[PDB]
Amino acid sequence: VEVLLGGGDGSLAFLPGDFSVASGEEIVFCNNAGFPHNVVFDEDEIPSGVDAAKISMSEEDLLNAPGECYKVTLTEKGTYKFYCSPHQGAGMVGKVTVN
Ligand SMILES: [Cl-]
Ligand SMILES: [Cu+2]
Numbered sequence: 001v002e003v004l005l006g007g008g009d010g011s012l013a014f015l016p017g018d019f020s021v022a023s024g025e026e027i028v029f030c031n032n033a034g035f036p037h038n039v040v041f042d043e044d045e046i047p048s049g050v051d052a053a054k055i056s057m058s059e060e061d062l063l064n065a066p067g068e069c070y071k072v073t074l075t076e077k078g079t080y081k082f083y084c085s086p087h088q089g090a091g092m093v094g095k096v097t098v099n
Contacts, residue, residue: 001027003094005063005084006034012087014094023075023098030069036062037084037092039070045081047098050074059085074098 004015012034021027029039038061043052055072057063062085063070074080076098083093 001025003027003029004032005029005037005039005069006032006092008033010034012084012090012092014082014084014092017094019095020097020099021074023077024073025098026071026073027096028069028071029063031063031066034087035066035068036064036086038062038086039072039082040085041080041082045079047076047078047080050076050080055080056082062086 001021007013007015031037038057041052041056046052057070079095079097081095
């Protein structure tokens with residue numbers, strides 16, 4: 001599935017922000033507006049056994065360009081809470097349920 005990074009209206013948001021995906025299904029986070037953006041999963045908000053370092057972009061990596069995206073494939077079932085480092089304080093966070 002595809003999630004847009006930033007609304008055209010200026011919102012620093014994941015569109016959709018709360019969504020579901022089946023185990024093994026990919027999620028492609030594409031820059032839309034308001035970038036730089038990046039996608040970082042909260043180590044304390046991801047299913048048991050998942051390595052946040054494998055499913056996250058480095059806090060120092062940013063999708064700085066308009067056509068850039070970040071693809072991640074999640075398998076362990078449960079909810080995962082992720083955010084954008086630069087806009088975390090502005091409310092740019094999201095949740096995905098892997099069923
Ligand atoms: Cl992992
Ligand atoms: Cu951002």
